[PDB]
Amino acid sequence: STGSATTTPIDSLDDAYITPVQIGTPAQTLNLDFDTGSSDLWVFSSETTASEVDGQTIYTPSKSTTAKLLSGATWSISYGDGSSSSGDVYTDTVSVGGLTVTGQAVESAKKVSSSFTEDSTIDGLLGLAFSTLNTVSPTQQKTFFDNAKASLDSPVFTADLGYHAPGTYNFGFIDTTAYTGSITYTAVSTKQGFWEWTSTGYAVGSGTFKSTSIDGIADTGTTLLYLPATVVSAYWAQVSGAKSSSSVGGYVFPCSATLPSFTFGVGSARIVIPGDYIDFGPISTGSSSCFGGIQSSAGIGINIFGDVALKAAFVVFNGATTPTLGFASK
């Protein structure tokens, strides 16, 4: 089998991407944030504290003839941005782009933190990291990809995120029309549960490439590119007036600037992030200070190849017995 679904930016800045997902019988369609940095499929639901729901579409398990309470199971997750959610668990039929998994764990939120409530466009998350990170207790549950894998024509999914435009998540096949050149594959460590790999270096604009190993994760659920402070300083030093602002929480730059590109290495190959992809707009409405799309990872503990980096590439998440990542230009 295969599936193919369009993923759409939630706003004009590409702050996140939403993909329609069918849950239950008859189908209830929710727009989920596909997140290769986590491993829980959780949704706003008829069980979510009413004051914490503000415009999201909810899953109502009592209206699904295929929903079954997973007795005794609870979940609770905290993300790197400080947001969180928790609740109980159903199994139900879940379809993405024509690919169907029966018995998928659908984690129903009883509580969500304010940032989820405040984002009316995101009805939940669909985790695509390794199932070892799944938070369901006392019986850990498998991701949608893990459940689908055996049925897929090839044990892969691909992320093709758009810049200020829709893109595609495919399951089970590699669309050879969706990228240019060849796909360069690189090793993955699953030891932390992430699609963790090592970039071979970087360049800023037209500058010379610096060969240096940068371990980090391919994370579709993180908006920005988080890299070591040395790398990030080298980038922003090329932008007149750019500075790290403790009050804002990162590098800012004059909105009047034209940003240089940023290149990262994948083996001997190179992925070029155009400068415009690094502009996240005014820090507050009407400000002429703009927020940078490349930020330091120093306070995180891991480097994160988030959407800013991934949307410059066609990315293969290869879930074969030994997983690997592939990157192609597009």
Swiss-Prot record:
Disulfide bonds join C255-C290. Its EC number is 3.4.23.22. GO terms for biological process: proteolysis. Residues 17-328 form the Peptidase A1 domain. The keyword Transport does not apply. The active site is at D35, S199. Belongs to the peptidase A1 family. This is Endothiapepsin. It comes from Cryphonectria parasitica. The lineage of its organism: Eukaryota, Fungi, Dikarya, Ascomycota, Pezizomycotina. The gene is EAPA.
